[PDB]
Amino acid sequence: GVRTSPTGEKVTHTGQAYDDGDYRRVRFSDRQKEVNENFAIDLIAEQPVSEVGSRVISCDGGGGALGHPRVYINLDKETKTGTCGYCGLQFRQPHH
Amino acid sequence: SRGEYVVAKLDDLVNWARRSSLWPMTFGLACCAVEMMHMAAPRYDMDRFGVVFRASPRQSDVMIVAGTLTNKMAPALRKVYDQMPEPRYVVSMGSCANGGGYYHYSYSVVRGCDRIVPVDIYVPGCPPTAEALLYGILQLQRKIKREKRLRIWYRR
Amino acid sequence: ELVQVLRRGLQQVSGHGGLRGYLRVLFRANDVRVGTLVGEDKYGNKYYEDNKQFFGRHRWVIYTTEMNGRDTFWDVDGSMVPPEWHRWLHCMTDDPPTTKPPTARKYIWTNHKFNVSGTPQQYVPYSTTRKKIQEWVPPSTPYK
Amino acid sequence: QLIAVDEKLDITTLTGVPEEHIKTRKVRIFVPARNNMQSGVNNTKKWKMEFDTRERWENPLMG
Amino acid sequence: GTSVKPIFSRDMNEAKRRVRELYRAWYREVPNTVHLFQLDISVKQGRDKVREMFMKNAHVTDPRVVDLLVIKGKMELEETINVWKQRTHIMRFFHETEAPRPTDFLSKFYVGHDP
Amino acid sequence: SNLTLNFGPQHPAAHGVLRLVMELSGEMVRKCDPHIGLLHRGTEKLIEYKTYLQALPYFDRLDYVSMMCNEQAYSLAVEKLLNIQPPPRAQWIRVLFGEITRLLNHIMAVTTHALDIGAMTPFFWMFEEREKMFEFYERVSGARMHAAYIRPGGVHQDLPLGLLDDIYEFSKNFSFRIDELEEMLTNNRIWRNRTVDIGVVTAEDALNYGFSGVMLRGSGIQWDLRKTQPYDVYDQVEFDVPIGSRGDCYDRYLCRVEEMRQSLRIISQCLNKMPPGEIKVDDAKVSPPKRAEMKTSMESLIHHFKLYTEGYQVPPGATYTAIEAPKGEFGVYLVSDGSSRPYRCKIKAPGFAHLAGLDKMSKGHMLADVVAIIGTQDIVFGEVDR
Amino acid sequence: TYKFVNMREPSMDMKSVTDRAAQTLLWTELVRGLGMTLSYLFREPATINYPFEKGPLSPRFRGEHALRRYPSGEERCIACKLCEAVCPAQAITIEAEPRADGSRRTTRYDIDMTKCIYCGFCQEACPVDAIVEGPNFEFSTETHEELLYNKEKLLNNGDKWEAEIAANIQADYLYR
Amino acid sequence: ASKVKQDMPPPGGYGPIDYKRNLPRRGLS
Amino acid sequence: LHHALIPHGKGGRSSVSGIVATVFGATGFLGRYVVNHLGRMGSQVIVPYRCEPYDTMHLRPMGDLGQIIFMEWNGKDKDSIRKVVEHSNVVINLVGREWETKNFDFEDVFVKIPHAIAQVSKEAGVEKLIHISHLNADIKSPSRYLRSKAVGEKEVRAAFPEATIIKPSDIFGREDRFLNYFASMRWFGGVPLISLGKETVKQPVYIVDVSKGIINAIKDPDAKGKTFAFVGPNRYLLFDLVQYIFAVAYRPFLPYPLPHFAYRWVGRLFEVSPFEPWTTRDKVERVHMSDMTLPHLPGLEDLGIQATPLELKAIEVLRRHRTYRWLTSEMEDVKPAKTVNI
Amino acid sequence: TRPTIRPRNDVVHKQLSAFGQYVAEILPKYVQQVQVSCFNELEIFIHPDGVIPVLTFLRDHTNAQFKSLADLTAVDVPTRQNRFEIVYNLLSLRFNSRIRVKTYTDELTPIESSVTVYKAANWYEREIWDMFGVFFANHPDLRRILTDYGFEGHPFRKDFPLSGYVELRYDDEVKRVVAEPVELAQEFRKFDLNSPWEAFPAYRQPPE
Ligand SMILES: CCCCCCCCCCCCCCCCC[C@@H](O)O[C@H](CO[C@H](O)CCCCCCCCCCCCCCC)COP(=O)(O)OCC[N+](C)(C)C
Ligand SMILES: NC(=O)C1=CN([C@@H]2O[C@H](COP(=O)(O)OP(=O)(O)OC[C@H]3O[C@@H](n4cnc5c(N)ncnc54)[C@H](OP(=O)(O)O)[C@@H]3O)[C@@H](O)[C@H]2O)C=CC1
Ligand SMILES: CCCCCCCCCCC1=C(C)C(=O)C(OC)=C(OC)C1=O
Ligand code: SF4
Ligand code: SF4
Ligand code: SF4
Ligand SMILES: [Zn+2]
């Protein structure tokens, strides 16, 4: 989800861009500004919400011991999905 | 034109001679010097690239700062750098020489040898492997290949 | 057995594509050994194996003559090897990426880049955080 | 035999401390307050000496 | 009583005599230091500096502290005579690359927060 | 008036950072005055701002020719202060890699000593063996020399499958390299002329001057900390202690070569006796839990978090722990105030006292003899200056 | 248990004395040393043809650092700061805040590679395998500034080396 | 449910390793 | 004041001075001292260079990490100038040559390039411009160097009215062409002097004084549109000055008078070298021309600097020109030369 | 208390306690305290005046024979009226034993040099003087050993800052290395690690 500033400088995923009157931009002359193009927030936004038939789901991030510490997520609320505090994967009980 | 062609060819010849005969000073400070010794060992054999140690600064082309530079040592390193005839090059090897490394916050350590001498190549690692140092040396060779001394003189 | 070694030398001359290929490899890599081709990069690097050589000479790469933008006929370096062949070439594994391809991910670079130091593509550090203290903006209208 | 001095102890000329960092500093001597986030009291037993806080600024490179 | 063990001197008079010996040694040594280290200062500059360093500690009234100061001065002189110090060490006494720091209240107020 | 000379720091035989102020009459050495501190980095003060784990890598960089031995000395000091015991397999791995480290150090010492004297070739032959040994280091830890492999509580990781076989393959061939080195040096009359009766030290003077290791055993003193004050599992391996008779450079060189052979013997015993089991102490308040446990169980996660942020507290007290490092007795005086950071850590390096004895050892000798004596003391200045 | 290294005696029979005299006058041990060097001359050298050939390395080798991702592309790092706390050189600088979607993520992740000692303690401390030491070791630069890595540089390194990094982790993780 | 697998010496131990000095006489009278 | 350009720190290497300076001509004699003084206090320095990068290496240690940035430029290309002055609040011009090359004459380096620099800096919004001229700049001077200097200062004032113009007189220092130039005249046996140097008065100024004056003029808000003359504290006859130079170097001084036409012939002869000439006709004219007296202009003391006399700093330049027999001779051993100070 | 816990040695503990009582009986003029730690290390706390008579005894007595001086260092404890703890570690090869001798001093009180007892002490005492400022009387050649020439202060004191007061760089105007007040692009980040819960009840102090 890259985006450009009024100066033409690419904005990073941290939302940091040099102002129009900032001298520090001179550091990029005759060179470039390193920017990572794979924005994690947009990438996790594309993952679908998993429908599971239990009130409590378990997530370890996939890969077993190659993931994150295994946590349990409550799915009682029907107004929102259950989000993993490590991975960002979303879960819900079937509704409608 | 013919003059630009001549000076470009002469630049090529001189750069080839200088990058093919690189003589570093016999100079090392700490653990990184051990990795440098391993670069001269038969497995890597830097001599096969034309790189030969010489003890005298008058007879050396390259300074490799291989180890921590202390405050007590800094004037001596500056002295032996100044006594190298030109052209001369400096390779900073290892975290200590690069920026202070493990001992960055010490009262008695210079935080990077670039505070004392200008540096052409920075080689990271603690220590860099002998192969990493060889890569840095070849990078310095490619940097010497790009010099345009005679062209710039001709354009003056 | 001198005739055997002479015939092996002539065989090495013939196995590099004739005299021109033999001299090309001799002047580009200072080595004229002929080995079994293991695979080829998308960038043009070729990989050869010969287990009859001792450990360290049993695997090698012939670098491509043209990478991303530059002419690498004479100027080559180890950073040109892409990661999969980097793993095979340093003997961190026994399987080339041809028989054991790496796991595909959508965020993995499709184009390997070498050491770009000294070029306009070089990395330039900068602070990645936002401005911390916000200054008061005076009103734009006269006060009397 | 001992020499029987009668003056208060002063070692400033021997410590190698710059003049500015002797006469312009103010030290605080105190028992540190318990961190309110925890109930343990083991960090409130000893006395601490600390110096006055001076200026910190942003490095133009790296911030 | 105060039951204190001396270092070299029992009272202030012997400590002052040792101070005078060290001062004479430094004063004699200064011209040799100027010649050997190839300094661009005058002999008067070096002696003025020596005097200044001695004057820095004029307020000390403890004979043990005076004895230790004389010990340190003798160490510095021995370092200088044997050319263990280099030119950078000798010139460090003069602070030739440090900008002059203001002392009056107003200039310090303008430049920053330090008292 | 004697001529005064700066021998180093920028000198081939000065080891990079040693400035030796020499007073000479012709080439006769009237006086040696070593000036050190050109590699003083303030390690002992820096350690006071680290946790014990954070302080561990500083020991790799003291005697950078013998890394895991320094790690072992520091780990033994901390384990003594913690009143805990490393598991047996960790102790066997420690002894095995300590003897590999002794091989590395003795190769460096002997070949650089020969290079100072003028025999340059054996350095190249033996540094390929050093290279192979470096691979064993990197395979076990990921680093060629500064492993940080040996930690208080045991070792960081278990041996990868297949490492023991490769170590055996190297060990069954190293003896022939030793034989070639001895064929080049031991009976050579030039080498003997350069080493025999040079730097002769008496046993009484060696003891009074604080010498240790070969600097003692070359003078006939029958002392080896592995025999007299064993640590880990050294009381379970058979080896001999080489003892000199003249106290000179030649006997010390012979002693070091024989110590290499005995190290090969010990390595063989270690390879054949390696037991199964865990490789760090089964106490998660000291050694971190396995990564799978950390990601599954609450106590393991808490202990991982605390050990990697605060570190373990060490009970208050002070210990002087010494080992028979390849360069002599290497010791740590460690003072714990009860917190998770060491209060004081004085490092005792054998090279300190050995180099302090250099002026005594050089009496009546020439310049080249002093070069040989510097080589025979086996000095590394990372541990001398700290 | 000990042995003597230099406590032997020579036999004084005329045969041994004459052999010693012949060694003294005809330089036999010097010829032995010459023979050893001649033997080494005809051995195959141990030199590898760098950079076309490389030295062997382990899956555990510690190289240039990288920041990793989950298979969905989400960053693994959740700004716990254990790597920053454990780092023996204080080479890591971390700043964090809640993201626009409420996630716990870093805004600053800097490693000073001229301060770093490449000990690998950061990757041991990391609970989610976010920061790693990769296999790359050929990343020398011409300026000091290029070795002060920010978060974008480390994420680019992860994206560039993940294929190798994942295989090395798969090879080694059962020992960790 | 597999067996414990660790780097260990082969059954019966490793083959004997030489360490002693070997400098043959190798000369005439 | 643009918060990122608000001074911070103690004024040392890691501090922030608040100055962003583009220094044209930074690879020469005065440029290294100016860059060192800017980097001492934590300024951001931009170095436009046309020479080989190997020839800029000595400027790298002069600033903390990130504080000295090197960029290529072309004196005949205004886009390069725009590129290197885009983000600066201070522009210093130290570009100059003491001889004419086949690509750049005196008018190119002293009129056209300063005018382009001033105009581009004015367009780009640079706040402060420092331009270096000569004390003896004159539209009717016998030296074309000084005529070009006068024309160039006129054009710089036309294109950047708020410029600060600084006119030094014969800077001496370790890398100078003044003290070293007169000390290198011994290689020819005698010392040729027009009229034996008896009709020439010189007022040379120390290099560090000039560099500190430029720094202080940057820091002085009143120095905006003024013209300064940087001269030393003493005035000497050329004969006495050269005799003092040879005495400090402990070389035999053999002065002889050479007529103006013959000296011009010698200068033209030396002008034919494709390398750096040993001397030129213009150099001959400038050496034998008296320094102007300009009391109405402010000087170094108006910027808080007491001028360093030559007698305290001649040895640091001329010790290198001594034989081994005289290397250790001390500074106060030479008996300073006579001065004609009004 | 099996595999995890370090084993005890009562025999060595008893032997060291008996020898400490022996030493205290022989030299009551100087010995202030004797201690045996639980990992079997013997410490003897003495008055400073007894540095030479005690060490000599431990070196020369037929039943001590502590011929080796392994190490000699100092510890700085600013809360004590006598700031500096002086520590001698001795090794007896005849009896295969080690002993530690401890004494104290302040900033202005000299300690007798022990070069006449152990020559190895020479450099060690220099290092102490270099790092802590403790003056040793009758030292043959006392001067800095580890610090730079002209260095001011004693870095190993607790009140000396970690980065010191001055740093070094090459200056081109003067063409030499110069020392200037230290400025850090990144300040060392102080960490507060101590847990507010007591770790070891066996070392709890009375609450005053
Ligand atoms: C006659 C006496 C006076 C003259 C003195 C000089 C003696 C003759 C000069 C010798 C010429 C030989 C040089 C040619 C060798 C070049 C080899 C080649 O490889 O160079 C390439 C290109 O070479 C250079 O571009 C120029 C080479 C030739 C110089 C240009 C022609 C000038 C000749 C004019 C001679 C006149 C002398 C002066 C007369 C007064 C760059 O490739 P390189 O990076 O290395 O290889 C990387 C290593 N890899 C392959 C393993 C990865
Ligand atoms: N020195 C003195 O006594 C006096 C000096 N001045 C003025 O001070 C300024 C600097 O003095 P100094 O430093 O001694 O002169 P230098 O020649 O020592 O420095 C010259 C600078 O100008 C640059 N330069 C020259 N010609 C060109 C060009 N055509 N295109 C681009 N850059 C060019 C050089 O770049 P490169 O290095 O690439 O050639 C170098 O950086 C000059 O303007 C001089 O007139 C004024 C009065 C007296
Ligand atoms: C001829 C064999 C190759 C020698 C390579 C030159 C080594 C330069 C480093 C100096 C040095 C030497 C000689 C050295 O021997 C040594 O060990 C004590 C060091 O400590 C790391 C050194 O730094
Ligand atoms: S960078 Fe690491 S290996 Fe190199 S000298 Fe410093 S501590 Fe030793
Ligand atoms: S490898 Fe070690 S020094 Fe480097 S960032 Fe990680 S923890 Fe810090
Ligand atoms: S990289 Fe790992 S240890 Fe470091 S802050 Fe992120 S999650 Fe925590
Ligand atoms: Zn999850």
Side-chain angles (χ1 to χ4, degrees), chain A residues 2 12 17 21 23-24 26 29-30 42 48 51 53-55 62 72 74 79 81 83 87 89 92 96:
Chain A
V2 82
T12 74
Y23 82 92
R24 266 160 315 152
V26 79
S29 299
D30 264 9
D42 301 334
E51 311 282 332
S54 57
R55 297 173 57 190
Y72 298 79
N74 180 266
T79 324
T81 60
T83 307
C87 216
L89 291 175
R92 69 160 89 100
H96 285 172

Side-chain angles (χ1 to χ4, degrees), chain B residues 26-31 33-34 36-37 40 53, chain F residues 12 15-16 64 115 123 379-380:
Chain B
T26 304
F27 183 85
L29 306 164
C31 347
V34 169
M36 197 159 63
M37 260 177 291
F53 270 119
Chain F
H15 307 239
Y64 36 84
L115 197 147
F123 162 93
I379 300 286
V380 66

Side-chain angles (χ1 to χ4, degrees), chain E residues 35 39-40 43 101 114, chain I residues 10 40 316 319 330 332:
Chain E
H35 266 208
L39 304 175
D40 307 322
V43 174
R101 300 209 60 75
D114 294 297
Chain I
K10 274 294 210 63
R40 260 189 206 173
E316 73 148 53
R319 201 202 287 278
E330 81 267 358
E332 67 259 47

Side-chain angles (χ1 to χ4, degrees), chain F residues 26-39:
Chain F
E27 285 208 37
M28 284 309 270
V29 178
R30 287 296 188 254
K31 177 150 109 93
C32 279
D33 177 28
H35 286 235
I36 65 174
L38 296 177
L39 202 64

